[PDB]
Amino acid sequence: HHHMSTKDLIETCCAAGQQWAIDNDECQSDICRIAQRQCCISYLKEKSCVAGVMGAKEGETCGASLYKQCCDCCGLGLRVRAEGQSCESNPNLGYPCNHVMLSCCE
Amino acid sequence: STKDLIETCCAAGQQWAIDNDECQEIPSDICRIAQRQCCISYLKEKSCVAGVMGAKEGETCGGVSLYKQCCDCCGLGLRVRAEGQSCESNPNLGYPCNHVMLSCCEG
Amino acid sequence: STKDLIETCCAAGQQWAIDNDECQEIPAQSDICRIAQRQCCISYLKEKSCVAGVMGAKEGETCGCGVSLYKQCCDCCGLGLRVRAEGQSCESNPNLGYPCNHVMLSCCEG
Amino acid sequence: MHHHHHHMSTKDLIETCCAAGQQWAIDNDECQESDICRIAQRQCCISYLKEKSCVAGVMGAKEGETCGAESLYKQCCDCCGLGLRVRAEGQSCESNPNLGYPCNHVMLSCCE
Amino acid sequence: STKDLIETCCAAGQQWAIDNDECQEIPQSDICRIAQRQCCISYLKEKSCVAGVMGAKEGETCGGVSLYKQCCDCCGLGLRVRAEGQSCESNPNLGYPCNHVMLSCCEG
Amino acid sequence: MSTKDLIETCCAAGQQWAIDNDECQESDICRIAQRQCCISYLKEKSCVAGVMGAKEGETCGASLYKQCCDCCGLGLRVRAEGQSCESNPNLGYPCNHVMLSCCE
Amino acid sequence: MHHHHHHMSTKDLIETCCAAGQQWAIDNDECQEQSDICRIAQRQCCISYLKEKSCVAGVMGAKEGETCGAEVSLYKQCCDCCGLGLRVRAEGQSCESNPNLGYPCNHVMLSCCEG
Amino acid sequence: STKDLIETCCAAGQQWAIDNDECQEIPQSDICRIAQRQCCISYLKEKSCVAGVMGAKEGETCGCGVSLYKQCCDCCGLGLRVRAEGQSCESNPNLGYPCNHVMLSCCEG
């Protein structure tokens, strides 16, 4: 077994997952596995998203993915800003698209 | 305007999500991006809400579906609440997992 | 239980309201659940739009198949404001309905 | 141009136009019918029709009528039906303010 | 005299407006043709404007030389302000006759 | 925003749109005020150009350019004949005003 | 969201949920039936009731000559353990507590041996 | 004698439990088989129970085998929570054995 509350186990397994994501670029007792996987995936998602945003700002192609999603959503904001128009929050775009579009627009 | 075009193409995307339950064969870059993103967001939020309800109903938790993710994350919050403990925000869990865990933990 | 199902489906409805600004296309499901979902979705949007409406009126905005009470609560608040502005006290008028009466009184008193 | 001016207080105007609205609702079943007056008229007109349709809805549910598919008739029928189903299961009614007004009140009344 | 010719040709233009509801067709001197056309257009404009004002006051949806829509819209501005218990302010940027019509509808 | 302020705001936007772009394609209250102030600006500008055209001896054509050019031309022709100007309100606005101004 | 809160002590909640569990066991023979405290107490009291009942049936089974079974319910266990005590008694030997048999086997063996 | 056979087969069962952590394939008279199985199960039950209790005291939150790990952890947890509230422990035999005993033990100090 383990000798740890459910809250502490979540914290512990979350940190392990993040650490696994940093160590390896992939996310390969149920409570622990869920927290591990979720924190692993979130780290890789946020990283790919930030790379995507930087890609758009640098003029790089988004492709044809959180890289692509964040690149495209940043591109929306850039194009609006380029037209001299003000940015408006559109929650229908979802997360993180809306936030990314606004950030790139402002 | 670009703002109105986004709104228009966003509504088309939502409508496509309702009609087909997928965003793969969806039909300017601005329009295509807004369509796809609003299509995906709709399916994500729908599957997430279903997932939360699943967890509260005692279902086993186990494309764009957040059914499993939201079910799992809700389940974290429920288990902590069931132990009489308070939950703490953990942004490392990501979105919407953190928010869903907290919501399920605090009622 | 039915009570827990109502709570569960109610929270789903509220969550749907927060996520999308509508309850018309709220997505193998029981009537009890569908009713609670829709009703909690609508209540959330009504209360939110109402509070926004009240703030609108107090900030000097002139209001004059959805569920928004923006306009209603703005107008009803405006009634109370105008009475207050004339130095008069308000009187409860339940015929105005809910939440118009309550909102008018609240805006009339302070 | 000459016009007829009146100097009725806002409070009195609200009362007056409210009574007119209610009376219009009673006379005709629609609310097609100064901003102060128009708001009070419409709101009192609509409240009357809403309360009436709501009470009809409650009676509908208690009689076993269908509420409709996918309106205050329908809303109050559905909300009453929640309370009825809970009562039918032998369970006690719990206030749920999240259901809003008048749904919560109607659910409780039909439950108890 | 030129003054009398203007009056004469002006009355002809008004008459043409009444008869035919347009000013494209001419029923001779530049002075006369100009006065005819201008008085024809003015008559149709003022008529359509007054109809537009009445439309707005009667609750009609608003909307060539016709000012029906313009005067209906501009009246509607004044009505809405009046309905809110506020006084109107002259705004010359609205142009003529929009400003005048808005004010008239706002005052009563 | 109050209705009065919204009218002012949307009016100024319309004028600004007219100045920026030479056309008026661009709440109902806001859209009406925008369009009306846009159109008035373009109308007054074309009218003033028309008046200047007439005074410079330019042809009016065979439009507020043409209207104001023609109306100015009435006043010019009366003045040229040595006759005094008389207000004729039946000519309407701005024709009457323009004719008088060009006549005096 | 509005929620209904209650503030019952842990001790009272245990008592309450324990009584519910026992009642459920009496009403229905399963223990399938929101806080962990309540769920634990309910389940434990439900299962204990069914265990003690099946055990007593098992003891009576052994005394009546019934087969215990082969290879929640303590029917078999208590029947077998009673049978141990009966066989010792049948040999004219005195009963000796053997705690290694565990609970309730030891107690049941002794009772059947002496009784 | 029957008594000695019980003791013998009981010790075999215990020994099997110590060697392997199971009694499902416990490898002959009925008396012997019963004693073997029962002593095997009791040993694993008591062991898992004591581990469970220690788990709860060390801050673990536990809420078709023979393990009492979870049961004894949960029951200990009841006693701990009551003690943590400053309240006195009350015996509740309806909780059964060993839940009641374990709850009390964890409650008292």
Residue numbers in the entry:
A (entry chain D): 423 to 450, 459 to 494, 503 to 544
B (entry chain C): 427 to 453, 459 to 493, 501 to 545
C (entry chain F): 427 to 453, 457 to 493, 500 to 545
D (entry chain E): 419 to 451, 459 to 495, 503 to 544
E (entry chain G): 427 to 453, 458 to 493, 501 to 545
F (entry chain H): 426 to 451, 459 to 494, 503 to 544
G (entry chain A): 419 to 451, 458 to 495, 502 to 545
H (entry chain B): 427 to 453, 458 to 493, 500 to 545
Q: What is written in the article reporting this PDB entry?
A:
We were able to obtain diffracting crystals and solved the structure in the P21 space group at 2.2 Å resolution. The structure included four dimers (AB, CD, EF and GH) in the asymmetric unit, with each dimer in a local two-fold symmetry. The overall structure of each chain is predominantly α-helical, which is consistent with the CD data. There are four alpha helices (T428-D445 for α1, D460-E488 for α2, L504-A520 for α3, Y533-E544 for α4) which all run in the same direction. The loop structures between α1 and α2 (N446-S459) and between α2 and α3 (G499-S503) were incompletely modelled in all 8 chains indicating the flexible nature of these regions. The structure has a disulfide bond architecture which stabilizes the three anaphylatoxin modules. In total, 8 intra-molecular disulfide bonds are found in the domain. All of this suggests that in fibulin-2, the three anaphylatoxin modules are all embedded into a single-domain four-helix structure forming a dimer with covalent bonding via C500. Cys500 locates in the flexible α2-α3 loop, which is only partly visible in the electron density maps. When combined with the non-reducing SDS-PAGE and MS, which both indicate that all of the protein is in a disulfide linked homodimer, the crystal structure data implies that the inter-subunit disulfide is formed, but that it is not stabilizing the flexible nature of the α2-α3 loop.
